[PDB]
Symmetry: D2
Subunit: 331 residues, 4 copies
């Protein structure tokens, strides 16, 4: 007798299990930039949002839902409880705590571990077979933490790692050459952020190695100072923090790009953080960025990049420092 029943005849009310569901944990600026970019790329048939701040969480959910007319993602849900995350193919973690003035790395990392001790087991409960994509900083250590806590095989725990660093690098490279960043190739690997390593040998347009054309490239004897492109990648990040307080759009776009490869099983190669034990003479359980093949199983393969001695030593130093912190952590 109702209006819905006058208007619509139902053939059946079966099942309803999402096929391409994504969860974002943490609805700060980063989380929401991930959400919007993922929504506008039509990657998911369901999106779930989780946070501990319940008002903010509900408000962000509602705001996205109100744009449903202009999207092709028919179900957006949110909640403090992880039942809303059930059956996710991909779970993206941006949650964590902010470092404070004077706080040690060890103490900041330990705080995030304690946070992950609540997040990860509940993610796993409701999506045992998902891929985990860790964005929270320090991303290389927290990828390790998520791997450790989740018990997932290595291929399904991915750190955003040097994906943002490389995108920034390619942007700057584009600007200098007057070429779209898509056609400017170059890889920043190792530890995300301050200690990242630009691999000068790979820097190229149309297969033409910039290093080969200009052997001083990357060295201090370069009159054109191409090393500065990498230094401006790092300066860029501090500047964006200083100017707007946080970074959101670029990270969100980059994470959506990782999600596309994973959700559509593309097997594209991205610079992301993976268990690096057994490479570059690293013998500890540490995660660092190398180019990885990303698809439906997460990281199925990785590329073995030939590094100069200086590049190797820089990754190996990063690995030593990360393990130094990691081995003092309490799970």
């Amino acid at each position: 007798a109702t209006l819905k029943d006058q208007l619509i005849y139902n053939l059946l009310k079966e099942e309803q299990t999402p096929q391409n569901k994504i969860t974002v944990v943490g609805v700060g600026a980063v989380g929401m930039a991930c959400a919007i970019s993922i929504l506008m790329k039509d990657l998911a048939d369901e999106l779930a949002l989780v946070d501990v701040i319940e008002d903010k969480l509900k408000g962000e959910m509602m705001d996205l839902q109100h744009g449903s007319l202009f999207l092709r993602t028919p179900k957006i849900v949110s909640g403090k409880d992880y039942n809303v995350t059930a059956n996710s193919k991909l779970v993206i973690i941006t949650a964590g705590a902010r470092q404070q003035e004077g706080e040690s790395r060890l103490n900041l990392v330990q705080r995030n571990v304690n946070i992950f001790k609540f997040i990860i087991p509940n993610v796993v409960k409701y999506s045992p077979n998902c891929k985990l994509l860790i964005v929270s900083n320090p991303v290389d250590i927290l990828t390790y933490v998520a791997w450790k806590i989740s018990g997932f095989p290595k291929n399904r725990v991915i750190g955003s790692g040097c994906n943002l660093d490389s995108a920034r690098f390619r942007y700057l490279m584009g600007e200098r050459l007057g070429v779209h960043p898509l056609s400017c190739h170059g890889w920043v690997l190792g530890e995300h952020g301050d200690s990242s390593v630009p691999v000068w040998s790979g820097m190229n347009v149309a297969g033409v190695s910039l290093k080969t054309l200009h052997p001083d490239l990357g060295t201090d004897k370069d009159k054109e100072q191409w090393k500065e492109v990498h230094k401006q990648v790092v300066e860029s990040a501090y500047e964006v923090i200083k100017l707007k307080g946080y970074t959101s759009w670029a990270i969100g776009l980059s994470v959506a790009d990782l999600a596309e490869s994973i959700m559509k099983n593309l097997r594209r190669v991205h610079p992301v953080s993976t268990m690096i034990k057994g490479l570059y003479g690293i013998k500890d359980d540490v995660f660092l960025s190398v180019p990885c093949i990303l698809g439906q199983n997460g990281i199925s393969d990785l590329v073995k990049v030939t590094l100069t001695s200086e590049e190797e030593a820089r990754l190996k130093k990063s690995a030593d420092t990360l393990w130094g912190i990691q081995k003092e952590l309490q799970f």
Copy 2:
């Protein structure tokens, strides 16, 4: 020579104008949501941002730029100076002061009018032939204002109006019926916000009028209280503001939708605010939302919705109220 000259043999120097340039004025949450949505829909070959807060502006510009690898908009610029906006096809105004503790509505309006007194002349100067899309509140008044100051013909001055209202209506309608909002048709017209008017006669799925099936629809005696759907539209806005402090994603997406029709000359029909003088017995210079055809020269046509007497009287009261404020405004 330089590495660049070793790599690249140039045929042509003399650069052209961007051909599909958009400017967003005001990089608050609304402006930046508009921006990301426009970038991800590939509507512009250049995007300009303007604000008066210089640090924020630069920071937002850089953050977007850093995502360039994942976009197809080759030039993103910003500045306080409107020379960065030159030759825009479309300028979206989201700049606004927010109402302060104890401030009256009239005084709030007047402060936004003062902001437009500076913005509009600057926009006109550098893009004399653009379309103006006004989002800033109160949107119906501020669209009138923008029209009056710019001296543009009414086809090139468009207020976001009831676009968001209608999008929200259709999301709720879709949730009630279990149908994607794209296939749920309903129009909210008139004054944006609290005083907006749901046109129950046009509410339909698949051309099957809900009012024809359920004559009580939209009345107090409606046994199923479908009038609450519009109540919830208005409640939603207050709740989102209560929960997260502002709205961004939905308005950003709805503005990109308008921008698409305009930039791609689609001639789709949208509920936006336009000069209504001479319709529904309204005789004052006021802007209210009706379904308009949007394209290359802005609003080329409007659809003449058959309204009930009650419906007309509601638009007329909105018009009287808006005109009443407008004649006390200092230009």
Copy 3:
């Protein structure tokens, strides 16, 4: 070591059951138009092609594969053997002969029924839980045939039906009003092709019913002869056959649109052909087009369009003719 093994370290080998797979059966002009449209809308992670002409099938597969760089569908396969179709979510049948000179109605149908007796079991064997979307003509009858042979519930057997008829109608309607077809709403229902029914009561822009503004809409004495729009839909089809020999692009696009709603569980409403027994005084097992909600489980719901006496009689007359052929078929 192979170059591959020197370049790439493998973490695990594969290989998940297909997750978002579509099959197209019949790689003639319609089949291949569907394929390219599906490929360009990023709806599948694997596309399989089947035909009985083996070289042609291989050539079409390779031509698509050669475009792989510009696509986001990582696996394209084909073969005469239906093992290439395993674990498809959606199987689109565009296989068949065409209406011959001299040959009646019942004989052409029977030649396609014979084709279907081989195709359908093979499809069902390798994708027992797929949705079937039938395009082959006469489409309403062959959808029935697919349903009977497959043994699938009715929600999982969909005929393209009046999806194309309705697109053409809205294209013509938009040409008349100077408005994009997306904003020009109108439903062509019933039997696909010559005997389809334009539902004048639903024809509207922005929920303004044209029948209400112009009560002569669709009648003989209409001074503007709007019945010609529908007559032109039918004439258009005959004209394209006369001019070009076949139709491909419009049907290709229409099908991709249906696939989009199904693959993404959108629950949009489309005019497609479904088992209509129990409606409009119809008491035989026939498929006719009504507006259906399309999603991951095919047709979950249909909209109950109010039809005038004449409209209703035209549907019943189609149903009789359709059943009169169907009772005579040999399975």
Copy 4:
């Protein structure tokens, strides 16, 4: 007052010109593949079709028009007369004779040059400012011809060239390495034909040079015979032609990729047919493919690829062969 006048109020008439008009000359298999690819990528606000066969032309136009509901290109036009092509930003030429099974593209010169003597002046007459994108075979030679006839500066005369050959190369390379072609980098330059040159020295994944890992790469001594990958690229057209009579989908996608860079001023790098005078000691006005930066002024820059001695010798052989043909041509 007609129904239209009752429904729609006009603010202003006067027709505007399109902003992003594209023309396709020849509505054969290639032309129409180009069309559908361009339409589905939203590159144009007007598409114009031209051919000498008037019935096929109109039929193909109509078929495209009938899919308008599913597109975002509001106007599609066709005609024998080049007045339909006026104001084109980009004009794509796909008209003329194609290869029979086993036939060389170089056997098409007399036929297709004589066709170009009528087509090109007509195109230039109505769109004197357009970019020309030549697809008709033999493409490198006809790009030279189009340049000589048109009197355009060479930046605005672009041959589709080896974009497709490189796309096929990267697909094949992708299959061998288990990586998406987008992440497999490798260039095939020179003639779009038998004399094309694979640039082994530039092939890489994630900037890791395959030649450094595998010094015999591409040589006769190669144990994995990677030269066979190039051989397959050379033979591709013949193989597909033998199987399905012609090739269409891959070139359609290739052409749309090129059109995107041009129309959206991306400045991406693509191997396209252009004048290579001044590189590798070539003095002749020969057109063949090298990587070019493509944008709104067409080819703005050439990338100077560093070729090995053997690579460069092969490219010069290609240039000699093509120039022997080009230089005998009479205008």
